[PDB]
Amino acid sequence: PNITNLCPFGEVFNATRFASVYAWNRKRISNCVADYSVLYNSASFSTFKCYGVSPTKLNDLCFTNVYADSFVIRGDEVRQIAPGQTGKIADYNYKLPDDFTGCVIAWNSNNLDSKVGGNYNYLYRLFRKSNLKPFERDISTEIYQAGSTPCNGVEGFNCYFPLQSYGFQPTYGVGYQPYRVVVLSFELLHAPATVCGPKKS
């Protein structure tokens, strides 16, 4: 029939500020119509790599919920947003499962997220004792203990603050320029699936 109540993709992609990768935003999208062809046919995205599903049948299938995770990483770190990868972002910041169904969308944001003095508002976790579980968020700011001595809450020797700032600048190389990444996770659960694609007339 006639379709209304589109899914809020404007508040995810066109957000005025994005979160840091250590504190990545997760928005649960339910009970609306998700038009994925608007995203796929856009020329503004550099990465639209979908794992476990093809973009052409997204506009047909129907899902119970859609998880939209949004963060900012470097240009060289976009490859680590994939199942089975290894790196600082995958181990310590944002981990994707091997059995992941969804799409990883990334685009360059040197225009917005870089300033001439250096934009240090974006943080990433550099050290953690263990690798993250899939879809885990770590926002702890406790001092990393690399040595046998206790840190006692002070950053001294062998004790480092685990969150380190990015220093985005507009004169940076393409492997260091900021990239806004939105990861959509599609799951089907035994509840009635309500996020369906648009139906042609």
Binding site: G118, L126, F127, Y144, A146, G147, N158, Y160, Q164
Partner: peptide, 16 residues
Amino acid sequence: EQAKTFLDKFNHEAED
């Protein structure tokens, strides 16, 4: 491993 973590911290802050 302590030296490796120290070198990671050094690399990251020295590069900036």
